Amino acid sequence: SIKIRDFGLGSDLISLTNKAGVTISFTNLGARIVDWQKDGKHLILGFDSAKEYLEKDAYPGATVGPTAGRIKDGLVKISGKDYILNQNEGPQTLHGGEESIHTKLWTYEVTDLGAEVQVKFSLVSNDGTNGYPGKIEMSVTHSFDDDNKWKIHYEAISDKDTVFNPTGHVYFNLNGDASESVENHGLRLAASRFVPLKDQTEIVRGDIVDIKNTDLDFRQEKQLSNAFNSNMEQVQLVKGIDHPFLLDQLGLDKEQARLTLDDTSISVFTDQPSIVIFTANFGDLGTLYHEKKQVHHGGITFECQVSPGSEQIPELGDISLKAGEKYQATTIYSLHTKLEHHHHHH
Amino acid sequence: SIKIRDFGLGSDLISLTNKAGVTISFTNLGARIVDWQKDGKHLILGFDSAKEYLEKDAYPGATVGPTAGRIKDGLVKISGKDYILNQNEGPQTLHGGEESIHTKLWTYEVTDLGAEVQVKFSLVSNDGTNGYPGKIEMSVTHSFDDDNKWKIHYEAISDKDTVFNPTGHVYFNLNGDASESVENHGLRLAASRFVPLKDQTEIVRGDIVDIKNTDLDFRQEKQLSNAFNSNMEQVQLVKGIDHPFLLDQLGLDKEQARLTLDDTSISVFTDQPSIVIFTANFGDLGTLYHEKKQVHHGGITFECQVSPGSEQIPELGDISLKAGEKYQATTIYSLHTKL
Ligand SMILES: C[C@H]1O[C@@H](O)[C@H](O)[C@@H](O)[C@@H]1O
Ligand SMILES: C[C@H]1O[C@@H](O)[C@H](O)[C@@H](O)[C@@H]1O
Ligand code: NA
């Protein structure tokens, strides 16, 4: 079933319920996921109206871009040319600059395929917007099916050579309450290396480091508390995790990550090379979610994309997008029950 | 009464009905006027869904900008520096460039004041959008009252020196049908001068012309056919009217223009110095409105703004907007019925 209603300020809330009774909802404000519930329990973090997003935190669940992450000094090189993008974080360009895509009302159309329902959001980034050559015609399709798979498919075409590397900023919290730390969740992640940050400004350090056998090694499932309790320099620098993890094996076919809590698991699939993880290291900020004051470590992201810092570490990849070339990206979050035995206590 | 409904593609339709039974409707798609009707008759042109506007014509009733009109070669000088804006009509920049603010979904909030209802639309034009320095936080407030006054109030603030001169692109047609020419309407317009076009490119010619005692003199009410039948080269150039008229006296209190058809009349008030009039000179195009094929001369606009062409004719005024300065503009369309 499909339902639509005003969500505030002119945005709409599109709610889907699949045959299993699982419901998920999106808004055209930032082509964003707002909620995902199983049996009355929220699996992700979200607000109750559009204004909350604009007044509390505009990132949760959003589509962010055109480039996700930080670009040192907002400088990129496009076809031998240097371009400076909007710098909204000191001299850095963070998540595409100020008042970026996550803050706009996208147009959308809904396609009912029966076992699957797709919600295709569209937006055009005009040439020069925030310093980005364009125009860029973008589309983000969120779909949910009877198999409990929530899929995100990105498509884009530019009139000019530009850069493109968007992501989805959902935050999970299997506790269903932001005031409950995710340190009690089990995490499995197929990555042997990570990208350290230089310092508090959070630009990349310049090197790639092997994390096998460290408190950041999750190849084999472990509780998130292991990472949170770590005094490794990188953990201490950010007060949790806030780093790109390089996947060891690529392909949409492979389960790259799995987040578990008791009988529920979220599996992550993608065709991208890295997973940027941020564990809501907000300290005592306490942003209110459903009237619950969010705790430090009260959420975790799995931002699939080309790793940030390729400007400094070419080995990370290339986010350039050629004029007329079609960009595509696919990320999938699938929900399961009783995938494994996870009975722990915090 | 207020009624909000889905208008297509995620856009909304906000319909206001005053104490008089008059209904006016807007959409956040382009902070635009969709309909205006009395006793079941449409007074303006408009479509029945968001898709139509995107597929047929995106300008009708829209807020256009940041700069309304044509900019020769897309060139503007800002603080002594040349800036090239998006070019969407040949080398010209027309109505802010491609995929401009009229094709965006604006956020909005409705404020019910009883005798008056306001709908505030907001949009941020990012720095660099279509070549324009910014960012520019813009708001357009459309309001409707019990006195049948439809008012447009624009506000804007830019983080950097830029240019700004938006306008409302409603097309009136008192016949209430697109297949019927407005040649039968009477027009009065308090302007003794106009800005001639250079040629078919429609860029300004460079001069300011006195129109007193010509087919374009509407200082005294006259029928549109007059103009339409004129042999003035400027009329023949565009096959109608497609020009900036310079108001003789400025100020919001003065009725600057009046469009009449029988018992019905629309009065125009504004704090702007010029009124750009375009008479839908589309020829055989035949765009469909409510299933009715539009005819050449099937509509007429009153775009109040600073006249286009100031890039070449400085006397027309100046559209710059300095960082931190607050831009304001007001335009009112008043509906009257003879009794
Ligand atoms: C990946 C994350 O990095 C963090 O430092 C920012 O604060 C987040 O909003 C961001 O998305
Ligand atoms: C002033 C007018 O000039 C005309 O040529 C255009 O086609 C109109 O849409 C524009 O508003
Ligand atoms: Na809507």
Side-chain angles (χ1 to χ4, degrees):
Chain A
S1 84
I2 310 149
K3 299 305 215 162
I4 313 211
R5 81 152 156 94
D6 58 297
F7 191 57
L9 315 168
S11 70
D12 294 338
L13 178 62
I14 302 107
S15 306
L16 322 174
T17 303
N18 65 2
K19 121 191 225 133
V22 177
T23 70
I24 187 173
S25 61
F26 308 96
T27 180
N28 60 325
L29 171 72
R32 180 202 304 271
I33 178 168
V34 174
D35 194 15
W36 196 9
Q37 276 187 214
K38 191 195 143 238
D39 300 330
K41 191 182 279 154
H42 296 299
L43 300 182
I44 68 164
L45 297 187
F47 304 125
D48 296 304
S49 66
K51 197 167 125 294
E52 274 186 89
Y53 280 101
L54 306 185
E55 309 197 319
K56 305 156 157 189
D57 175 5
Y59 295 111
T63 280
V64 310
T67 61
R70 310 190 155 74
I71 288 165
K72 180 203 163 166
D73 295 329
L75 178 91
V76 304
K77 239 205 197 9
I78 299 156
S79 303
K81 246 177 126 260
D82 278 1
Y83 287 85
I84 312 98
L85 313 171
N86 181 266
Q87 300 177 293
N88 52 327
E89 191 202 63
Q92 268 63 257
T93 292
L94 166 77
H95 297 327
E98 79 190 333
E99 291 299 316
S100 50
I101 69 170
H102 65 290
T103 70
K104 314 283 198 216
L105 289 170
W106 298 43
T107 56
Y108 69 93
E109 287 189 276
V110 171
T111 292
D112 186 356
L113 304 169
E116 178 179 328
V117 168
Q118 305 174 347
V119 190
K120 181 167 163 176
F121 301 91
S122 293
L123 189 75
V124 160
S125 173
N126 298 70
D127 178 38
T129 297
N130 274 4
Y132 298 86
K135 70 173 189 278
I136 313 185
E137 312 188 27
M138 312 173 264
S139 96
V140 183
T141 307
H142 286 280
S143 69
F144 195 44
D145 70 24
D146 290 335
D147 296 303
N148 288 324
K149 292 195 200 34
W150 160 35
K151 164 176 31 155
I152 320 163
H153 182 59
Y154 300 84
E155 309 180 286
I157 293 290
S158 184
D159 275 6
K160 286 185 184 179
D161 293 342
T162 186
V163 294
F164 200 74
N165 182 41
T167 201
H169 209 290
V170 56
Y171 281 94
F172 290 91
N173 181 343
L174 312 193
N175 283 304
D177 177 338
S179 74
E180 287 179 2
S181 164
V182 302
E183 61 178 336
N184 70 337
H185 285 39
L187 176 72
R188 170 208 126 345
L189 173 72
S192 289
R193 297 162 301 158
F194 94 147
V195 186
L197 316 173
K198 188 137 148 178
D199 50 29
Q200 116 227 24
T201 66
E202 306 185 4
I203 52 159
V204 303
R205 196 161 65 194
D207 61 318
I208 296 154
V209 161
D210 175 288
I211 38 102
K212 303 212 270 274
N213 314 304
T214 59
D215 297 307
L216 301 177
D217 181 356
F218 287 88
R219 283 167 318 133
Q220 274 214 6
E221 197 200 84
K222 64 203 187 65
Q223 299 291 271
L224 275 156
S225 52
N226 297 108
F228 296 147
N229 292 346
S230 182
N231 55 17
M232 286 171 61
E233 169 244 334
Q234 291 282 316
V235 172
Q236 286 196 127
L237 178 68
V238 310
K239 268 106 223 324
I241 309 178
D242 196 356
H243 299 81
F245 287 73
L246 305 182
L247 306 164
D248 301 333
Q249 298 190 348
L250 306 196
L252 202 52
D253 56 307
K254 169 125 180 241
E255 186 189 25
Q256 313 278 14
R258 177 197 308 174
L259 181 81
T260 302
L261 178 58
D262 291 317
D263 297 301
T264 305
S265 303
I266 295 313
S267 300
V268 183
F269 301 76
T270 181
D271 60 357
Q272 299 302 289
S274 95
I275 301 173
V276 174
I277 290 168
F278 170 54
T279 55
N281 311 316
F282 302 118
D284 73 350
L285 183 53
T287 295
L288 285 172
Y289 279 86
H290 315 311
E291 308 297 309
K292 304 314 232 89
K293 221 195 280 18
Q294 183 179 221
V295 290
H296 182 65
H297 307 149
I300 183 170
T301 73
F302 296 105
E303 300 171 63
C304 299
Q305 48 168 107
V306 165
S307 175
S310 67
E311 294 77 23
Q312 283 71 230
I313 311 170
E315 306 46 54
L316 292 176
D318 176 48
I319 57 168
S320 91
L321 180 64
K322 286 183 143 1
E325 289 187 17
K326 197 215 268 154
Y327 171 95
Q328 279 192 125
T330 299
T331 295
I332 304 165
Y333 297 99
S334 82
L335 155 73
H336 294 103
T337 276
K338 318 199 81 173
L339 209 52
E340 65 182 48
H341 316 287
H342 180 270
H343 309 301
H344 299 281
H345 76 80
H346 292 244
Chain B
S1 92
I2 295 150
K3 187 244 325 164
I4 298 154
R5 78 159 170 88
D6 159 42
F7 199 40
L9 302 176
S11 74
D12 287 351
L13 178 70
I14 305 104
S15 295
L16 329 179
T17 286
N18 68 0
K19 254 127 259 175
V22 184
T23 298
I24 197 172
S25 70
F26 316 94
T27 181
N28 56 332
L29 174 80
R32 118 172 39 227
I33 186 162
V34 176
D35 202 14
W36 200 3
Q37 80 180 52
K38 198 179 84 278
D39 299 320
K41 181 118 147 208
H42 297 309
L43 305 165
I44 69 142
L45 307 185
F47 302 122
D48 314 286
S49 69
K51 212 164 227 217
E52 282 182 82
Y53 278 104
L54 291 191
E55 313 195 340
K56 311 174 193 179
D57 180 4
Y59 293 116
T63 291
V64 301
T67 49
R70 299 181 163 84
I71 295 171
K72 189 183 165 288
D73 291 316
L75 187 42
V76 301
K77 208 146 301 101
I78 290 154
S79 59
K81 189 182 189 149
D82 287 346
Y83 284 83
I84 305 226
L85 310 171
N86 182 259
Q87 303 163 296
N88 64 332
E89 184 189 61
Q92 268 55 260
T93 292
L94 164 79
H95 300 329
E98 78 190 335
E99 300 304 300
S100 207
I101 68 181
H102 62 293
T103 66
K104 315 286 186 183
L105 279 175
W106 286 55
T107 54
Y108 75 97
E109 280 186 290
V110 179
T111 299
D112 185 350
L113 301 160
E116 184 188 328
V117 180
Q118 311 169 337
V119 189
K120 196 199 209 161
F121 300 94
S122 301
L123 187 75
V124 170
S125 170
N126 295 81
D127 173 41
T129 309
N130 275 7
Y132 292 89
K135 71 190 183 284
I136 314 172
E137 298 188 344
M138 305 161 308
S139 84
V140 179
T141 307
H142 280 295
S143 65
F144 195 50
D145 73 14
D146 288 328
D147 294 315
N148 295 327
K149 294 189 209 129
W150 160 40
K151 194 219 316 204
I152 322 172
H153 183 63
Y154 307 79
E155 316 181 90
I157 296 140
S158 174
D159 279 6
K160 296 183 177 183
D161 295 341
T162 195
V163 292
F164 200 70
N165 185 35
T167 202
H169 212 280
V170 63
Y171 283 99
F172 281 107
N173 190 334
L174 305 188
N175 288 310
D177 173 344
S179 69
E180 289 176 26
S181 168
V182 302
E183 67 191 286
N184 55 356
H185 302 38
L187 163 69
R188 200 192 95 239
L189 168 72
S192 304
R193 288 125 87 220
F194 89 147
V195 179
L197 309 184
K198 191 199 236 165
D199 54 32
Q200 57 319 123
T201 64
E202 295 152 278
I203 56 163
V204 310
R205 178 170 84 195
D207 53 327
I208 299 180
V209 188
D210 186 296
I211 46 125
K212 281 177 195 175
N213 311 296
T214 75
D215 297 339
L216 295 179
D217 184 357
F218 286 89
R219 272 161 333 132
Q220 250 183 85
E221 186 168 337
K222 91 193 196 209
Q223 214 134 276
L224 278 172
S225 48
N226 276 237
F228 289 155
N229 290 305
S230 175
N231 55 46
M232 280 177 117
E233 67 100 9
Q234 285 290 307
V235 170
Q236 296 181 303
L237 181 73
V238 301
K239 311 175 258 153
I241 307 163
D242 203 351
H243 296 79
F245 281 84
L246 315 177
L247 298 180
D248 296 336
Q249 298 148 60
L250 318 188
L252 220 32
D253 46 354
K254 200 229 177 295
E255 169 191 58
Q256 305 279 11
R258 188 199 274 148
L259 178 77
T260 298
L261 183 62
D262 299 322
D263 277 302
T264 308
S265 90
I266 311 300
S267 305
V268 187
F269 299 89
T270 187
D271 52 12
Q272 300 299 299
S274 99
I275 299 163
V276 178
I277 302 178
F278 168 61
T279 53
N281 312 323
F282 308 112
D284 265 9
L285 168 74
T287 298
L288 290 177
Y289 290 78
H290 314 300
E291 303 282 48
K292 296 155 141 209
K293 188 134 71 311
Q294 182 174 225
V295 306
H296 183 67
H297 296 171
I300 179 170
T301 68
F302 295 98
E303 298 170 63
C304 298
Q305 54 176 90
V306 168
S307 176
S310 66
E311 297 74 20
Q312 286 58 248
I313 315 177
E315 315 92 90
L316 296 183
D318 171 50
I319 67 178
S320 74
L321 181 62
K322 309 294 196 335
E325 270 273 63
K326 190 171 133 100
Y327 173 98
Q328 289 201 73
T330 303
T331 297
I332 304 155
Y333 296 99
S334 175
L335 168 68
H336 306 275
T337 288
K338 200 182 355 156
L339 297 179

